[PDB]
Amino acid sequence: SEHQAIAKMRTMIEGFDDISHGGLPIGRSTLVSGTSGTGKTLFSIQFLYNGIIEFDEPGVFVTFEETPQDIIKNARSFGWDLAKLVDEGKLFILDASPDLSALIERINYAIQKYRARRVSIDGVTSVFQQASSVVRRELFRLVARLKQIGATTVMTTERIEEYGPIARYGVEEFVSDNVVILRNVLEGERRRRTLEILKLRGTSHMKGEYPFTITDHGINIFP
Amino acid sequence: HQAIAKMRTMIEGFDDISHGGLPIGRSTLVSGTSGTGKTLFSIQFLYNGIIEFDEPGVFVTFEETPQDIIKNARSFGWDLAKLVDEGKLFILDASPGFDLSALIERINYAIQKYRARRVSIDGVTSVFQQYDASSVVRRELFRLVARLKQIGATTVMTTERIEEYGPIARYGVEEFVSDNVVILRNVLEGERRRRTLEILKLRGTSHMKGEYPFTITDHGINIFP
Amino acid sequence: HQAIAKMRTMIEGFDDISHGGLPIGRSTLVSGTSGTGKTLFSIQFLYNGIIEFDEPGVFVTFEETPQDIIKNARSFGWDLAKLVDEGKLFILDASPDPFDLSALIERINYAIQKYRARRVSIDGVTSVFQQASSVVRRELFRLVARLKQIGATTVMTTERIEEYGPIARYGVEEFVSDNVVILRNVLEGERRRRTLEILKLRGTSHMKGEYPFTITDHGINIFPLG
Amino acid sequence: HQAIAKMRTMIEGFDDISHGGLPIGRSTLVSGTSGTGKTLFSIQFLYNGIIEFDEPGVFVTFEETPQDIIKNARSFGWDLAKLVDEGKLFILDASPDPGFDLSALIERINYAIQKYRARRVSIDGVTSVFQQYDASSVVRRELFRLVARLKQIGATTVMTTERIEEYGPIARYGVEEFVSDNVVILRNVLEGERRRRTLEILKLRGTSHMKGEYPFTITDHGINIFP
Amino acid sequence: AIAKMRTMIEGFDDISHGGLPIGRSTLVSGTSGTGKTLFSIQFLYNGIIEFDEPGVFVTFEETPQDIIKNARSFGWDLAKLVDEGKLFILDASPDLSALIERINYAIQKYRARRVSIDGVTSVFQASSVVRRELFRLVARLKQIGATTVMTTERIEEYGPIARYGVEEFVSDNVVILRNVLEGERRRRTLEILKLRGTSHMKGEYPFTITDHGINIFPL
Amino acid sequence: HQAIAKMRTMIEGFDDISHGGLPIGRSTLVSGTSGTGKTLFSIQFLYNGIIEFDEPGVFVTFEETPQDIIKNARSFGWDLAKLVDEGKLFILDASPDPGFDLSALIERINYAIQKYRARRVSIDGVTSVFQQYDASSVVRRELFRLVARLKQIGATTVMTTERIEEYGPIARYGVEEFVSDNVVILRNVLEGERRRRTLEILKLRGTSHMKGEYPFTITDHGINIFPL
Ligand SMILES: Nc1ncnc2c1ncn2[C@@H]1O[C@H](COP(=O)(O)OP(=O)(O)OP(O)(O)=S)[C@@H](O)[C@H]1O
Ligand SMILES: Nc1ncnc2c1ncn2[C@@H]1O[C@H](COP(=O)(O)OP(=O)(O)OP(O)(O)=S)[C@@H](O)[C@H]1O
Ligand SMILES: Nc1ncnc2c1ncn2[C@@H]1O[C@H](COP(=O)(O)OP(=O)(O)OP(O)(O)=S)[C@@H](O)[C@H]1O
Ligand SMILES: Nc1ncnc2c1ncn2[C@@H]1O[C@H](COP(=O)(O)OP(=O)(O)OP(O)(O)=S)[C@@H](O)[C@H]1O
Numbered sequence A: 001s002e003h004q005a006i007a008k009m010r011t012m013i014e015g016f017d018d019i020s021h022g023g024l025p026i027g028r029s030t031l032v033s034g035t036s037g038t039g040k041t042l043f044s045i046q047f048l049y050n051g052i053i054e055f056d057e058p059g060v061f062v063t064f065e066e067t068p069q070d071i072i073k074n075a076r077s078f079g080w081d082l083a084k085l086v087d088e089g090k091l092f093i094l095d096a097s098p099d100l101s102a103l104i105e106r107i108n109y110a111i112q113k114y115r116a117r118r119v120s121i122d123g124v125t126s127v128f129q130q131a132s133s134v135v136r137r138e139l140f141r142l143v144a145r146l147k148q149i150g151a152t153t154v155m156t157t158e159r160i161e162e163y164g165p166i167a168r169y170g171v172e173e174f175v176s177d178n179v180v181i182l183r184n185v186l187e188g189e190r191r192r193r194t195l196e197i198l199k200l201r202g203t204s205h206m207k208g209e210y211p212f213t214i215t216d217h218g219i220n221i222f223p
Numbered sequence B: 001h002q003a004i005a006k007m008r009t010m011i012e013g014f015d016d017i018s019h020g021g022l023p024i025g026r027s028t029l030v031s032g033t034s035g036t037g038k039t040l041f042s043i044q045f046l047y048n049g050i051i052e053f054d055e056p057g058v059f060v061t062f063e064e065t066p067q068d069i070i071k072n073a074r075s076f077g078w079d080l081a082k083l084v085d086e087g088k089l090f091i092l093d094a095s096p097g098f099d100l101s102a103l104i105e106r107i108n109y110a111i112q113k114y115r116a117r118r119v120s121i122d123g124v125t126s127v128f129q130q131y132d133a134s135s136v137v138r139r140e141l142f143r144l145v146a147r148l149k150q151i152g153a154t155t156v157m158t159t160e161r162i163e164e165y166g167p168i169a170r171y172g173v174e175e176f177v178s179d180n181v182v183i184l185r186n187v188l189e190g191e192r193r194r195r196t197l198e199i200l201k202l203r204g205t206s207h208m209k210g211e212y213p214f215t216i217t218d219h220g221i222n223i224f225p
Numbered sequence C: 001h002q003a004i005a006k007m008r009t010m011i012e013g014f015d016d017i018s019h020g021g022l023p024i025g026r027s028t029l030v031s032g033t034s035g036t037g038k039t040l041f042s043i044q045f046l047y048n049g050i051i052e053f054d055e056p057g058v059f060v061t062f063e064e065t066p067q068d069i070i071k072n073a074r075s076f077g078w079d080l081a082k083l084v085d086e087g088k089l090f091i092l093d094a095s096p097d098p099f100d101l102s103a104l105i106e107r108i109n110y111a112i113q114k115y116r117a118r119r120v121s122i123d124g125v126t127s128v129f130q131q132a133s134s135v136v137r138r139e140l141f142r143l144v145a146r147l148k149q150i151g152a153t154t155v156m157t158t159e160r161i162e163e164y165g166p167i168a169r170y171g172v173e174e175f176v177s178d179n180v181v182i183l184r185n186v187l188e189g190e191r192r193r194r195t196l197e198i199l200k201l202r203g204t205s206h207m208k209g210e211y212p213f214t215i216t217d218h219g220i221n222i223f224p225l226g
Numbered sequence D: 001h002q003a004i005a006k007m008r009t010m011i012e013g014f015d016d017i018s019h020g021g022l023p024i025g026r027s028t029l030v031s032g033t034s035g036t037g038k039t040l041f042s043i044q045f046l047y048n049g050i051i052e053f054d055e056p057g058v059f060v061t062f063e064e065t066p067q068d069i070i071k072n073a074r075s076f077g078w079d080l081a082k083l084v085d086e087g088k089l090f091i092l093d094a095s096p097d098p099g100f101d102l103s104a105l106i107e108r109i110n111y112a113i114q115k116y117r118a119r120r121v122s123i124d125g126v127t128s129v130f131q132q133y134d135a136s137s138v139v140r141r142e143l144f145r146l147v148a149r150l151k152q153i154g155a156t157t158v159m160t161t162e163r164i165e166e167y168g169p170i171a172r173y174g175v176e177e178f179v180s181d182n183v184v185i186l187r188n189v190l191e192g193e194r195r196r197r198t199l200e201i202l203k204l205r206g207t208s209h210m211k212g213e214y215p216f217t218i219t220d221h222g223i224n225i226f227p
Numbered sequence E: 001a002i003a004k005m006r007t008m009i010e011g012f013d014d015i016s017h018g019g020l021p022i023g024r025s026t027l028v029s030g031t032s033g034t035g036k037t038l039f040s041i042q043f044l045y046n047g048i049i050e051f052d053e054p055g056v057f058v059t060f061e062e063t064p065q066d067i068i069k070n071a072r073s074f075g076w077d078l079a080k081l082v083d084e085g086k087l088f089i090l091d092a093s094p095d096l097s098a099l100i101e102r103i104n105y106a107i108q109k110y111r112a113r114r115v116s117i118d119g120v121t122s123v124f125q126a127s128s129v130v131r132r133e134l135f136r137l138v139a140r141l142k143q144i145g146a147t148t149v150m151t152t153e154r155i156e157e158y159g160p161i162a163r164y165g166v167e168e169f170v171s172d173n174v175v176i177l178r179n180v181l182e183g184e185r186r187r188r189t190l191e192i193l194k195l196r197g198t199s200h201m202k203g204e205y206p207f208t209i210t211d212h213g214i215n216i217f218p219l
Numbered sequence F: 001h002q003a004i005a006k007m008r009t010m011i012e013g014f015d016d017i018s019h020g021g022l023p024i025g026r027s028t029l030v031s032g033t034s035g036t037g038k039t040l041f042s043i044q045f046l047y048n049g050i051i052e053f054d055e056p057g058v059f060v061t062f063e064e065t066p067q068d069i070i071k072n073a074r075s076f077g078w079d080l081a082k083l084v085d086e087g088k089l090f091i092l093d094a095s096p097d098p099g100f101d102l103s104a105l106i107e108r109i110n111y112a113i114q115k116y117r118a119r120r121v122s123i124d125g126v127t128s129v130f131q132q133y134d135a136s137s138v139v140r141r142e143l144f145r146l147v148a149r150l151k152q153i154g155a156t157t158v159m160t161t162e163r164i165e166e167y168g169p170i171a172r173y174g175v176e177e178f179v180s181d182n183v184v185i186l187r188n189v190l191e192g193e194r195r196r197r198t199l200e201i202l203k204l205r206g207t208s209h210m211k212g213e214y215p216f217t218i219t220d221h222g223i224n225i226f227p228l
């Protein structure tokens, strides 16, 4: 539908652009939260990968724990050659894994250098465990700075319960424009993966949980 | 004199539930989890005052920028920038302990300058979170409510909560120092979401009880029979 | 020399449940979540005492202003300003400008002597308590004992955050009080149901469990169970 | 098979549930939420001792005044003031006038026990003093030494404690039951808007007792327990 | 393959497939009045009466006098055994290593093979400290070659095995005594949660406490 | 190269559930409440490596003494003493003298690895030194460094940790699963008055696996898992 207020870019992730009514809001950050092994990193990568392959939009991936080499190695599970894209200057993996102000400028520099339209930030809450009010302000500053740059950003966060707080510090969903929840629910000894778009400021979207699978082709969502 | 009188919100179904609207000269707490429609409720309250009654409004925002408020309001067919240019709406940027005492006098300037009868305060929780102490939150919120009452503004103020059926708000005190409490819920059941609105209390006047289903549409909040 | 006597509240249904009303000379805790009717109960207690028995009352407010108290009471067709003007009611403002327990108690005593009040309602003492469970326990204990010396029959409101959880905020209030009333506002299947319970009345009898009630244009009405 | 001796409470039903009454020369913890009948159990225990057996009793109170104890007991037609005048009952007042010392309190209790030649003791409100210790470890050791001292005097003691949940911890600090020889739990269970009073003997060291909850009522005659 | 010693507690040796592993520590955890002390006592008493294996009982809160008096209700004369030198009740009711040394001395002096440690949880006021202290105690008893029953407390029937959430991880063997409320009735059950290096029956088995001690029915 | 390759555990049913075994050169976290079979899984991993593929193994123990490990494995008919005597299995006692330095341990581990030419490593009881810290942030960082150091040596590692609830957090500090590449959960669930053991592979980074819980028993031949 054209009659929505916020311009969106397509993830080209199957089923997600339907649920989000067109993709992710351009120039804004989308929180992607979930328990362990829910597919947060995969979503973040597939966002960048599809952007490059489909639209030749350069991407910057910021990682806080997983090494660039593990990211590249793990992506081969889906037939994606990220090293080749890194070689072409179409993908840049920014290694922030051994101050958030200095980091923001590193990202800013990479975005300008590589002319990136899409940004994924994976594992930023590992920097918080280092108070909810402090988390809230720092995230708020990061989101605002990314917006001023004009980046369209996916940022992952962690949660420890399938049905409970959106993320660890109970403030993350409130300073984000957009919130996506990945679940991996255990019921009667079986797991089922779901994705929910909890909110998208300024636009409609499908509500509730929608089933998805992770396969050799990445994330497949069925709305 | 009379029992407290009410101001019509013109939000479909709400004036029915509230038996006339929001109590005049007082603040109404509107609490909910993330993306429940709190900002929308606050905006629609002001927007309807301007369009339907030519009552000017002041919107106070703590985190969301004025430009984003305006842009997001276009989703509901509302041209806030036009209202700002006509001087019928003023958006006060409260983004950066935080001095709520200094803030309220800036709000007063705007109220007097634009002759506002309706005020919406969105995101005061972000300030309360610095406090991170129930006793301080209670005291500061009490003073804020008291100062607003002195001005005579009819006010909607939003707050956050983290559970659909737990505490009214974050610090377990907000509902006790508010005259009026509205709870917006976004309940997940069987993988589907169901939005509801409840008027928990209105001091000194009557209202319908329990939860009432609503949806958010291209025309804003729509509360069902 | 004999069993504790009771003072009638004239609150529709309560004197039945309480088997005569509130125990004379003692304080009754009325606890509830937000908007359960705690202030209304406290006010109706004084209002009925004035109107039915010509017993003067003192209302102590810690947050809500006297003006608001009066304004909100007009919802029930009650003219509190009149009762204040006639010297039958005093609203004692202990609320802060937009804590000394001893100073407050002497003000209450002064007011009780000045207006010859037999009934007292204290609304919002919780707000000063939040400024340690055992500090709260000791302060509350002292307030109760002091009111007892004066001979006041007192309604005292407190807050709770769950319908089926602790009686009040600090887990000690009910153990210090002689009498405990719980107001509930239970949400079940998107519908709210108000109930009143007399949990405890020291040295006397009372009906048990929850009894449904409503708040109407003329105050609290309590009905038979179920 | 040498049995632990017991003394009868004469509280209707209880001596059946306890198989003879309360273990002699030991302390029995009586825990419950608000208005569960803890003080009533404490008083009825002393009152029956005096009336039925001519055994003097000492009631130790920490919050409720002797005058209120006496006043409230008239609800059941008991004249405690008369018993105090006869020296059959002594209400020891430890209530505050508007870190306390145990050793002072116990020597008071000890003196009162010796003076009135009391065989039964009820201690009511000791939780109030364990509440700004407000530390489980501290409460445990202080309560332990209190029990040990009472045992030396040879007093058979009922001591009340508080709990804030019907089916949660035995008492406030999760330690009180572990340092008591005997534990009784009074419950006031709310189910479907109705209340149900129950008494349970959770444990009696070294002796037998009936298990689980038994319904009781409080009437003009005090506590009446049913099977 | 692992040698076990018989508790001779009715039904228990069946549940443990032959008794408690010799030279190992067994945690016996439960809420108040679940039969922890009774289990500890029977373990030593049976070892003495039937196998002439001396025992040491270590008590932290309950006095030796009360332990003796309470055991008498089961017809067990512990005073005779302590006077015969077959049993030693170590009053640890006045520094864990000072305790350890006293235990060791008693074991050596009385040539004890069974040890019951009852109420060690009262020593603690930090889970890491508790874990470290308990591990040292267990390790030392193992080096001595003692077979040990060690009681601990819990506050809920279903939840943490013991108070500090570490006790079950430092013990070789874990036994849980439950006293579960089912519609106003109590039901006693015993469960062996783990026995390192050997098999055992799984889950809960009902028992009663009678004039002859613990009576477990594994059927 | 391509997708991450896997090393066969030869544990009955597990290689089916993991679609080929444990990811080579990486650590797999194995979490469970008390007596769930974590040490057994760790031992059986090394034992099968030695017997089936002649791949030497190193077992790092933080609590159980080496002799207890050997003695406890005898109920499964595994002669671990012989394997130690042959130099095929090295048990590394990492218990502190009856707070901890990871880099010192990695050296001892690395040395043992080179010396015994070990393909497989099991680390059992590292949670005990994590409690010394009692801070999720500290635990998270320390574990992260352990995983990275182990990766640098190229060891395929089983790493046990603890939890106190069958259906609560994966491990103690709520961070362990997030810095691990691979996560296995052993459960021991009450069914009426009976117990039911289950194994779940929660995640394996960069590769596939079966989902949910699968029942297993512990017998005289160790762990036997039942898919289908
Ligand atoms: N080829 C594949 N086929 C099927 N499932 C796969 C495949 N490759 C990976 N997966 C799944 O994808 C998961 C990894 O997803 P991730 O995106 O790394 O999750 P994550 O939320 O980032 O978890 P973390 O970062 O480790 S907490 C694995 O646990 C597998 O379940
Ligand atoms: N045109 C529309 N049609 C339907 N739903 C819409 C439309 N526009 C917005 N929404 C919904 O409105 C939500 C946002 O409403 P808000 O009032 O901003 O909620 P909120 O409680 O203020 O959330 P915060 O401040 O981000 S925590 C979005 O998440 C959408 O679900
Ligand atoms: N005329 C009326 N008819 C029906 N209900 C009314 C009327 N006037 C007020 N009420 C109700 O009474 C409630 C207020 O009762 P209060 O006694 O003020 O409760 P409260 O427990 O003191 O709440 P606090 O102090 O604000 S937390 C309102 O929320 C209404 O639901
Ligand atoms: N004559 C009576 N008939 C029936 N019930 C009575 C009578 N007298 C008192 N009661 C009940 O007994 C209760 C008081 O029992 P108590 O022994 O004081 O309880 P409690 O556990 O000591 O409460 P505390 O100390 O205030 S927390 C009252 O709440 C009544 O429900």
Ligand SMILES: Nc1ncnc2c1ncn2[C@@H]1O[C@H](COP(=O)(O)OP(=O)(O)OP(O)(O)=S)[C@@H](O)[C@H]1O
Pocket: D177, D178, D180, D181, D202, D203, D204, D205, D206, D207, D208, D209, E030, E031, E032, E033, E034, E035, E036, E037, E038, E039, E073, E074, E209, E210, E211
């Ligand atoms: N002769 C007996 N006949 C029947 N049951 C008995 C007998 N003696 C004791 N009991 C029961 O056994 C319980 C005491 O068992 P213990 O082993 O002392 O419990 P415990 O777990 O050690 O509790 P603690 O140490 O007080 S927390 C009593 O509460 C009775 O229920």
Ligand SMILES: Nc1ncnc2c1ncn2[C@@H]1O[C@H](COP(=O)(O)OP(=O)(O)OP(O)(O)=S)[C@@H](O)[C@H]1O
Pocket: E168, E169, E170, E171, E172, E193, E194, E195, E196, E197, E198, E199, E200, F032, F033, F034, F035, F036, F037, F038, F039, F040, F041, F075, F076, F218, F219, F220
């Ligand atoms: N021969 C056997 N037959 C059946 N079950 C056995 C046998 N040998 C051991 N077991 C079981 O294996 C369990 C021990 O498994 P472990 O791997 O040691 O568990 P664990 O998770 O390491 O527990 P910890 O470290 O003590 S908390 C015992 O509790 C028994 O239930």
Ligand SMILES: [Cl-]
Pocket: A193, A212, A213, A214, A215
């Ligand atoms: Cl999947």
Ligand SMILES: [Cl-]
Pocket: B195, B214, B215, B216, B217
């Ligand atoms: Cl909607």
Ligand SMILES: [Cl-]
Pocket: C194, C213, C214, C215, C216
């Ligand atoms: Cl009503």
Ligand SMILES: [Cl-]
Pocket: D197, D216, D217, D218, D219
């Ligand atoms: Cl009753």
Ligand SMILES: [Cl-]
Pocket: E188, E207, E208, E209, E210
């Ligand atoms: Cl039994």
Ligand SMILES: [Cl-]
Pocket: F197, F216, F217, F218, F219
């Ligand atoms: Cl098994």
Ligand SMILES: [Mg+2]
Pocket: A040, A041, A042, A122
């Ligand atoms: Mg990831």
Ligand SMILES: [Mg+2]
Pocket: B038, B039, B040
């Ligand atoms: Mg908003």
Ligand SMILES: [Mg+2]
Pocket: C038, C039, C040, C123
């Ligand atoms: Mg009120």
Ligand SMILES: [Mg+2]
Pocket: D038, D039, D040
């Ligand atoms: Mg009492």
Ligand SMILES: [Mg+2]
Pocket: E036, E037, E038, E118
């Ligand atoms: Mg014991």
Ligand SMILES: [Mg+2]
Pocket: F038, F039, F040, F124
């Ligand atoms: Mg192990």
